[PDB]
Design a protein around this ligand. Sequence first.
Ligand code: 6HN
Ligand code: 6HN
Ligand code: BR
Ligand code: BR
Ligand code: BR
Ligand code: BR
Lengths: 226, 226
Amino acid sequence: PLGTEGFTVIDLPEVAPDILPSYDRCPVDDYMGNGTRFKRFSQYKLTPAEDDTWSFKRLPHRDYTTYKKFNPVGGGIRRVYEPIEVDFTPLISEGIRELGLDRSEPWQINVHQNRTRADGGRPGPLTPEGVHHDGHEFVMIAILNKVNVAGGTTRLWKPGADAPFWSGTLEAGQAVLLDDRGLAHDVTDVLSADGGPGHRDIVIIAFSRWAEKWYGDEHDAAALEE
Amino acid sequence: PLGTEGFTVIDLPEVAPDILPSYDRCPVDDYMGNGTRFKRFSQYKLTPAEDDTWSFKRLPHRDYTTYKKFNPVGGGIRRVYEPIEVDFTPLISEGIRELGLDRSEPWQINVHQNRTRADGGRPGPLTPEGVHHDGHEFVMIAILNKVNVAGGTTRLWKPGADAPFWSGTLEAGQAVLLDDRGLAHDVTDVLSADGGPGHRDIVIIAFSRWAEKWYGDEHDAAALEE
Ligand SMILES: N[C@@H](CCCC[N+](=O)[O-])C(=O)O
Ligand SMILES: N[C@@H](CCCC[N+](=O)[O-])C(=O)O
Ligand SMILES: [Br-]
Ligand SMILES: [Br-]
Ligand SMILES: [Br-]
Ligand SMILES: [Br-]
């Protein structure tokens, strides 16, 4: 499973030819990033399959809801996103293999397909939450494309620490897997590499056991404090 | 001067008839509030005048810059805003009288004319910074108009405290004056009162001594970490 410090960085396999172009068709995120972020969102059930594989089932499309206690800037509201068009589940299966997810019960994943844009004088913020936990058990963050950007350095923190214990800029074709309970994280802003427009295209996958799923009326009521 | 707990709430005089309509002509804030906020911005030199009054001089229009250490979601960047069209200096004089601003040196003020909109299912965030200091010596927040909104409760905090020591919902025609060093503040989100659109129209005035002004090349370089 994960490295002893609670994270692993991996190389990603080649992706299908529809993945990178699909980022050009992500609409603006009306809730986060103040116009610098573009997003699609889908959720899946993840079940252990015989032959020691995993089965993915796309769930009916629902608004994204998270808790203010994890995300103070985007929590506590219904966030209406459009579904992801392409199939990230081959990519996600690489992360699962490295996580060694507990096969004794089913899992539920949130999948966020994000583009953040940077331009001269306007960095693209990646973690306006600051140093945070996502609220899930594991998180996978995969970088699919970077064009004309600098910055975007991932920092991993022990809870309460004054400084991160690991920093690294993930490049296209890399992913980090995180123990999202034991570690906190942030990412420095995306910067324009030369003064002109640039962008950073990623997918974030948040893993929870189905028994603790971030999906459905009970989760929504809890996250919205209803 | 201010109350012994570092703040005072005051009633405001009647304002000129052009002030309330001017909020309809404030452009969207491209940098904060994710489309829920509209803003104009101007800066003034503030000097003591004989017969125990104060004189205001509007300074050449410059981008707003603040520090990430005070504002993690809107700091560290050049924020290009349009100037304020109306004259808030009569209202600001009411706050100055209550502050008892030291007349032994000149001052510099930042003036933010803000509208935050709320709608059903979409609150209007007021302090995405969370509990914060603005970074100035004194702050005045004046409420000019509230239409069909709830929430928007000001909370004042001792430094490092885990709960506020005072809470109150400022109404149209009220202002709070704050010791921005000795106390921190936040405000709960603006909510739609009935499920439909509503808005809250305010002006924020941040006071610094001219010797510590938030204006000009040196300030900008420090706030941008250049
Ligand atoms: N904090 C990110 C989402 C990261 C994934 C967490 N999850 O699915 O709850 C956002 O609010 O857009
Ligand atoms: N934190 C508010 C500004 C409040 C006044 C503070 N000032 O002038 O620096 C914003 O970023 O829009
Ligand atoms: Br944001
Ligand atoms: Br914001
Ligand atoms: Br002068
Ligand atoms: Br009240």
